[PDB]
């Protein structure tokens, strides 16, 4: 029985998000097609050109492919699955030259220079500051009125944390937060003219210069300790660093931002879970709004050999596409996964990824980020309302709000 599904339906098509989360047609799969194919017509493939690939809705395939990364490579098509259908495939190659998009043992020797600044003590240390600037963004917000969620509460935080984490100067923060911005919803008509080529050559050179200064006058953040050879002489170069801080640029930015702006809209949609999180300020809310929002929709990997999955033969060379936004609310895995419980404990959601080798470095500042924000909305904004509804994003693989207005005050 094929699953009940409009014709040619890709679940990859930004025309769908640009509108809703295909919440209906990800458990269709689930329930009848668990893993299945999905064909994509000539040209219309997001930059590949290779039929379809394999839908992945079941959260225990998504971690399996995330633990075989010996099978399922993240370098052999690069782990975004859409890009503009025109995009020329050096274009993707080029993505290889960031540790997301990299094997082992490459992937292996970056992760661990890399992992010295993402250690418990580094980012434990930005906590005081960012607790700071969550107080002052509400606070500016509810003096306000009224305005822009995304723009006014959502944005600032995860790029602040973004700049401490690599000490980046007061004054450079206003271009590293334009070239962050810029790198990402192009194929949005509101971001049609952002250049993400442009802007992460900017960000490269930037963080060469920056590089360069920081090894003649070291200091304590994690820029001296990724710079600065081990034992075994294992260090970032300069280039390595530019391609580490563009990731970063994309990967801390708009993920976190839409944990929060689509964690207050679901605290609106259930205020006793809201009454529930003024009073006891839970920090596994962080958690199931990060399962909740899933801001990253799916990511890909590339079979390197025949695989065999729940039954299904995955052939060597064949993409699958990890449906996180489907995974995180498997009904298998999760007791009632379409109710909002900010207490649900243990939370073994896949919004950071699978378990595996890729695994999100930053979900602890990602979820810290979280917590201290939505502190700092109930310290400031407690009875805040939305005024229309939001605004998504045109991508294929980014779940992402524009746009939502609020009422700051309620009244
Ligand atoms: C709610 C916020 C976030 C979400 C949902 C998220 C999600 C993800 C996902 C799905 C992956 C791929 C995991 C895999 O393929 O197995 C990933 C990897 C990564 N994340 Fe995040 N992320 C978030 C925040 C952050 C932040 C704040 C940072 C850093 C400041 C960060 C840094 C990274 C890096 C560097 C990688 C690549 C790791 C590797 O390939 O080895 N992320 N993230
Ligand atoms: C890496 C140094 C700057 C650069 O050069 C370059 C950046 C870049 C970014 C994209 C892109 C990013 C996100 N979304 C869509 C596109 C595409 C191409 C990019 N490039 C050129 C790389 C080519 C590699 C082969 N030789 C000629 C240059
Ligand atoms: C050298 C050019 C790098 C680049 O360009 C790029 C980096 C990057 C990082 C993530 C990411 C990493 C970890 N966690 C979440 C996300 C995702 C995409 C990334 N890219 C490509 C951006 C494209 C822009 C145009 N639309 C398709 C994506
Ligand atoms: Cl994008």
Not at 58 to 64: F, G, H, I, S, T
Not at 161 to 182: T, Y
Not at 241 to 255: I, P, Q, R, S, Y
Request: aromatic residues 10%.
């Amino acid at each position: 029985p094929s699953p009940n599904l409009p014709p040619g339906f890709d679940f990859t098509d930004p025309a769908i998000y640009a509108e809703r989360l295909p919440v209906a047609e990800f458990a269709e799969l689930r329930s009848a097609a668990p893993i299945w194919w999905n064909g994509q017509d000539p040209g219309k493939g997001g930059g590949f050109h290779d039929g379809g690939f394999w839908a992945i809705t079941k959260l225990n395939d998504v971690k399996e492919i995330s633990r075989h990364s010996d099978v399922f490579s993240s370098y052999e098509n690069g782990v975004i699955p859409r890009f503009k259908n025109d995009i020329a495939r050096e274009d993707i190659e080029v993505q290889r030259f960031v540790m997301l998009n990299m094997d082992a043992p490459h992937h292996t020797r970056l992760r661990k220079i890399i992992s010295r600044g993402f250690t418990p003590r580094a980012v434990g240390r930005l906590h005081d500051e960012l607790q700071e600037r969550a107080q002052k963004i509400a606070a500016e917000a509810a003096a306000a009125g009224s305005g822009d969620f995304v723009e006014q509460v959502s944005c600032e935080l995860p790029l602040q944390a973004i700049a401490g984490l690599l000490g980046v100067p007061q004054e450079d923060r206003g271009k590293l937060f334009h070239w962050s911005n810029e790198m990402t919803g192009n194929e949005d008509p509101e971001y049609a003219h952002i250049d993400p080529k442009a802007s992460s050559a900017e960000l490269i050179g930037y963080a060469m210069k920056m590089a360069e200064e920081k090894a003649k006058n070291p200091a304590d953040d994690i820029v001296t300790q990724l710079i600065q050879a081990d034992i075994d002489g294992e260090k970032l170069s300069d280039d390595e660093f530019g391609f580490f801080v563009v990731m970063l640029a994309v990967a801390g930015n708009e993920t976190t931002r839409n944990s929060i702006t689509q964690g207050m809209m679901a605290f609106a949609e259930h205020p006793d879970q809201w009454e529930l999180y003024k009073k006891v300020r839970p920090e596994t809310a962080a958690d199931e709004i990060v399962r909740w929002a899933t801001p990253v929709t799916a990511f890909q990997r590339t079979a390197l050999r025949d695989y065999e999955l729940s039954g299904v033969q995955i052939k060597k060379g064949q993409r699958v596409v990890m449906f996180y936004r489907s995974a995180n609310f498997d009904e298998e895995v999760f007791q009632d996964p379409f109710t909002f419980n900010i207490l649900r404990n243990p939370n073994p959601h896949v919004g950071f990824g699978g378990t595996g080798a890729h695994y999100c470095i930053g979900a602890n500042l990602a979820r810290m980020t979280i917590n201290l924000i939505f502190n700092a909305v109930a310290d400031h904004m407690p009875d805040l309302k939305p005024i229309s509804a939001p605004e998504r994003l045109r991508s294929g693989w980014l779940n992402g709000i524009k746009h939502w207005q609020v009422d700051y005050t309620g009244r």
